[PDB]
Design a protein around this ligand. Structure first.
Ligand SMILES: O[C@@H]1[C@@H](O)[C@@H](O[C@H]2O[C@H](CF)[C@@H](O)[C@@H](O)[C@@H]2O)O[C@H](CF)[C@H]1O
Length: 433
């Protein structure tokens, strides 16, 4: 029958292709979901969708949106409200058995405009064979990197952050962890420097960025304009401390079994031969998972994101993907039916355990069979419960571009003057209404 197109980030395309294929067996031949890839970069993801939306591409049906695009797509009319489902089932489905943090990212002006499908929060990943106890706060991270450099050990702090959205995410986490905020609750005022407490938070965050950027043994890549991968730096043994989203867990086991991780030669364990399937994905039996995870524990550990204020946890910026029905769709009923099928319990287990993307269904985090394959589950749920959020505003794309340009390169941050420049650039973004 008809085709429901399903646009997703390219890096997640294989995972969502698998989910769509499962969802296509359950539709009685009434319709088919066809996954289509978008570039890497949240901003260029959005750009491609916005061109199709303003050009009235009537073949565009369902979109996997970064959590920061809700306000823009809702206010533009590009994402239909879930109440536009002709069956009237979308809103109840979106909230049922779903964590509240993700749901907050899917709303605008008191209505839902998307159904959460994946969420995200960053953890500390470390080498337990080199780092005796994982740092609990950022001054401790700095000290550990220095101690490693002095011992001749890998000294990079690999943070998934170059000159774009990941850098804005890191800054947002530090800022909110210190008690600040980019914008006011209603999104209409810049609150980086408007009170002494807010200015103090912004300065504290900038001081941490600058300190990490200039630790002895820091990555020479910080200053340049090119793109590096924290995940790959750690897998290659260039860093013993990494701050990243939890997809690095699935990556570490898979690439180790393939032979791509020098300090974790799972490719030399006979019991793991053939645990890569014929499309290249690590798909272990229960016993193979136990063998690979036990081996990995010697060289790979995880821990909460480091705090800014010692003594209590960080407030970690939430990430993820929400499923929205485009206003261009010719088939609203089937597009909303597809959204419900894409986020069902079976496909949520799959998106976390094979795709590396945290599920949004609360039940999974209370499910011992899921917990046995997703060992980070408790820290992830804790960090999603008291999460920082990036500002929700229709001009987010312009705000993030202006913020990232001030922050980058982080070696050139000077906390007091950079704080004022940030506030002035943020103000230009929201002055564009
Ligand atoms: O498509 C990928 C995605 O771009 C990127 O997304 C994550 O970082 C972004 C940049 F900070 C956040 O804006 C986003 O919210 C958050 O999920 O890494 C994911 C895997 F962790 C991928 O699935």
């Amino acid at each position: 029958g008809l085709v429901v197109s399903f646009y997703t980030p390219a890096t997640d395309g294989a995972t969502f292709t698998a989910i769509a294929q499962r969802c296509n067996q359950q539709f009685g031949g009434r319709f088919t979901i066809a996954q289509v890839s978008l570039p890497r970069s949240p901003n260029e993801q959005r750009l491609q969708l916005a061109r199709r939306l303003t050009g009235n591409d009537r073949t565009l049906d369902v979109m996997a949106l970064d959590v920061v695009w809700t306000a823009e797509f809702a206010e533009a009319g590009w994402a239909l409200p879930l109440s536009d489902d002709p069956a009237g089932l979308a809103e109840n489905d979106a909230v049922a058995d779903t964590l509240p943090g993700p749901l907050a990212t899917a709303g605008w002006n008191h209505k839902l405009y998307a159904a959460p499908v994946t969420t995200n929060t960053q953890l500390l990943w470390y080498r337990p064979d080199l780092v005796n106890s994982p740092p609990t706060d950022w001054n401790a991270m700095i000290a550990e990197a220095a101690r490693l450099h002095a011992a001749g050990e890998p000294s990079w702090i690999a943070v998934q952050a170059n000159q774009g959205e990941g850098l804005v995410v890191w800054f947002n986490t530090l800022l909110v962890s210190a008690g600040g905020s980019v914008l006011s609750e209603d999104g209409r005022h810049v609150t980086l420097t408007d009170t002494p407490a807010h200015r103090a938070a912004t300065v504290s965050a900038l001081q941490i960025l600058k300190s990490v950027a200039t630790t002895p043994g820091a990555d020479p890549s910080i200053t340049r304009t090119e793109e590096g991968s924290a995940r790959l730096a750690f897998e290659q043994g260039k860093a013993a401390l990494e701050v990243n989203w939890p997809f690095v867990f699935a990556s570490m086991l898979e690439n180790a079994v393939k032979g791509g991780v020098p300090f974790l030669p799972l490719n030399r364990i006979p019991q793991l031969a053939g645990s890569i399937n014929d499309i290249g994905t690590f798909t272990p039996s229960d016993e193979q998972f136990r063998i690979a995870y036990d081996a990995s524990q010697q060289v790979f550990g995880f821990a909460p994101y480091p705090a800014v204020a010692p003594g209590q946890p960080a407030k970690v910026t939430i990430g993820g993907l929400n499923l929205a029905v485009a206003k261009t769709t010719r088939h609203r009923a089937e597009a909303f039916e597809a959204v419900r099928c894409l986020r069902d319990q079976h496909n949520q287990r799959y998106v976390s355990l094979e795709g590396g993307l945290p599920a949004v269904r609360a039940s999974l985090y209370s499910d011992p069979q899921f917990q046995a394959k997703y060992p980070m589950h408790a820290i992830i749920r804790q960090q999603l419960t008291d999460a920082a959020v990036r500002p929700a505003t229709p001009v987010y794309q312009a705000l993030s571009i202006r913020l990232a340009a001030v922050l980058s390169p982080i070696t050139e941050i000077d906390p007091e003057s950079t704080a004022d420049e940030l506030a002035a650039q943020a103000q230009k973004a929201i002055d564009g209404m």
